[PDB]
Amino acid sequence: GSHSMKYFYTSVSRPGRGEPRFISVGYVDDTQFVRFDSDAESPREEPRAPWVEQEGPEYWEEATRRAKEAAQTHRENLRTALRYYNQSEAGSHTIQKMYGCDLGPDGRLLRGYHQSAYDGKDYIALNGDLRSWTAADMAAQNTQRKWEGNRYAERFRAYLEGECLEWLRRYLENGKETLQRADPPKTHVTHHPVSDHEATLRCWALGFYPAEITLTWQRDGEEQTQDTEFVETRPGGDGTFQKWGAVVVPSGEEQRYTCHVQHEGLPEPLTLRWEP
Amino acid sequence: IRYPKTFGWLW
Amino acid sequence: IQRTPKIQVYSRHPPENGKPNFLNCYVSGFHPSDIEVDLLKNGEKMGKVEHSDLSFSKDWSFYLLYYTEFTPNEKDEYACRVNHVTLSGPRTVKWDRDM
Numbered sequence: 001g002s003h004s005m006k007y008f009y010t011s012v013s014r015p016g017r018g019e020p021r022f023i024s025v026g027y028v029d030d031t032q033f034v035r036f037d038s039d040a041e042s043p044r045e046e047p048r049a050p051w052v053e054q055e056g057p058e059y060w061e062e063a064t065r066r067a068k069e070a071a072q073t074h075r076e077n078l079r080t081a082l083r084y085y086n087q088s089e090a091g092s093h094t095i096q097k098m099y100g101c102d103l104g105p106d107g108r109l110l111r112g113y114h115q116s117a118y119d120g121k122d123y124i125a126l127n128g129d130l131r132s133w134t135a136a137d138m139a140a141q142n143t144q145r146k147w148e149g150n151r152y153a154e155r156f157r158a159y160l161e162g163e164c165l166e167w168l169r170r171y172l173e174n175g176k177e178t179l180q181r182a183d184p185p186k187t188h189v190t191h192h193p194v195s196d197h198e199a200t201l202r203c204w205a206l207g208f209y210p211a212e213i214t215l216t217w218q219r220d221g222e223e224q225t226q227d228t229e230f231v232e233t234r235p236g237g238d239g240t241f242q243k244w245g246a247v248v249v250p251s252g253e254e255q256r257y258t259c260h261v262q263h264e265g266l267p268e269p270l271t272l273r274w275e276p
Numbered sequence: 277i278r279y280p281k282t283f284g285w286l287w
Numbered sequence: 288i289q290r291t292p293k294i295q296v297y298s299r300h301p302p303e304n305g306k307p308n309f310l311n312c313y314v315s316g317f318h319p320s321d322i323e324v325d326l327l328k329n330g331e332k333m334g335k336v337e338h339s340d341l342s343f344s345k346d347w348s349f350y351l352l353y354y355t356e357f358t359p360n361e362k363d364e365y366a367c368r369v370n371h372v373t374l375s376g377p378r379t380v381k382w383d384r385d386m
Contacts, residue, residue, distance in 0.1 A: 007278060008342050010349075012320055023320075023341045026278070035340045048340070059277075066278040077287045084287070094319055096347050099279065117347045120288050120318045123287075143287040152285055159279050167277045192385050202385065206301075231386075234313045235339070236299050237354045244386070 002110060003179075004029055005168040006100030011074040015090045020078060022071040027100075028171050028179055030210040031239065036067040043068070051175025081118055084139035094119055099126075099156075101164040103172070112160050130157050178239065183209045184265030185243075189274045194248065201247050201274060203259035207240040214262035215245040224257070289373050290348055292317030294380040296367040302359040302384040310357040310382070312367035315350035323370040324353040327379070329363055359384065 005028050012021040019038070025048075026034035033049035040046075045063035047053045074095050082089060097116040104110035114126035122136040124143055131153050135144045147153065172179050185208030192200040203215055211233050217224040227248035234242050249257055259272035292314045299309035310333075314324055320341055326333040339352040357365065365382040 010320060010341055010343065025340050025342050032340065032342075037340070063278055066280055069281045070278070073281060073284055073286065080287045092319065092321075096343055098343070120290070120347050122347075140287075146286065150283060152283070155282060156279065156285075163277055163280070190385070231295060232293060232313075232315060234295050234297065234311070235352050237309050237311050237352060238299060242297065 001105045003103045003168060003172055004100055005103075005164065005171070006098055006113060009070060009074060009095070009097040011071070011078060011095040013078050013089075013091075013093045015092060020075060022074065024067060024070070028168065028175075030241070031175075031179060033171070034063065036064070036071075038071060049175065049178075051178065052171065054174065081139075084142065095123075096120075101160050101168060103165055103168050107169070109161055109165060112157075114156055126153065126156070130160065181209060182265040183207060183240065185213065185261065185263050187259070187261050187270055187272055189259060189272050191254070191274055191276070192246075193251075197251050199249055199251055199254065201249055201254060201257055201259075203245045203261070203272060204242075205244065205261055205263070206242050207236060208242075208263055208265055209240055210264065211241045212264065213241070213243055214260075215243060216260040217245060217247045218258045218260060219253075220256055221258075288318065290316055290318040291373045292322060292369060292371055294367055294369055294378065296365070296380050296382040297386065298359065298382075298384070304360050305358065307356065307358050310355045310365055312353040313350070314353070314367075314369055316344070316346075316348040317350075317371060317373070318348055319372065320349045321372065322349075322351070323368075324351065325368040326353060326355050327366045327368055328357070330366075333357075 008025045010023045022038040024036045025032055031049060033052045035046050035048055045060050045067055077095055095118055099114040102111035112130045117123045124133055124135045124140045127134055133144045133147060135141045185205035187205045190202045194200055205213060217228055224247055229246045231244060236242055247257060254274050261270040293316050295313040297311055310326055312324055312326055326336045333355050336353055336355045341349060343349045366379050368377050368379045370377045
């Protein structure tokens, strides 16, 4: 139904080594499709998805142009930031920035994204109304003042309702095979005896897309949070995701526990139980 | 696609 | 600020002895981005280890995936070594085919 297209910029100043490192990635939902690395042997926009590979030279040249433009912008923003926080040029610093657009079922702009942080902490973000800004500290209020002064929110907004949505749509139409896909996770329960009185039950959900998924454990129908371990959703390295949830159970009560998996690729939620 | 810089977003 | 990285060493598919597979090391929630990751086989660095493009989460913490091709067995050990500014010395997480 709803889709999303986001961009991630990461700039890292490296004293005594020259220009800052600029790494940017483009995502359609949970699928990376483009990359720009300043430390690449030939810095340029590159395809990380088969469906974007069909784009002509113009796309890559323009994309590279905008990427490098952003690179320079962030490059000045680093120094300006140095002035703001009264910092030294001998120290390493980082500017991060994520911005995207959300296509709804009606084909209209559902939600907008444009947030930037400095050194791991919020710096300035675009509000839901896509018109006003929110600054985290006093230094960011200067940036907010400037952006208000030059009507930046308007430009980025025209971008959100324009090229962003259209190209997102185009991508979705090009790579429907994998982008409009909803693969259900291959799930199963495993047994791992801790001692002669304890054993760990692990619930596996593999090769599912998109990444969003819910794993829970229940003892006699009641959710278990005690002695439970849920690992962070991880990439399979092939365009899929993985995630397992383990419970520490006293021997003899294994058949009293059930796994519960909610995923988009599943018609109904799954209820699993150890099958020796 | 990427955001086209026309004026810029200097901090 | 600075955050300690999470290390998840795991295979792409359920491990089978003699059957080819993909060894993965997912390092997440770390800051700054400067970090070293190495896939080790029996204590020695592996021959061909590539990684995904640097990206971050909603809390601005970075995440990376270092991967290689390996064939699981019962004589060899696989591990993931990580050096970071928040880590006093390299951290090594052995690959457990139960996790």
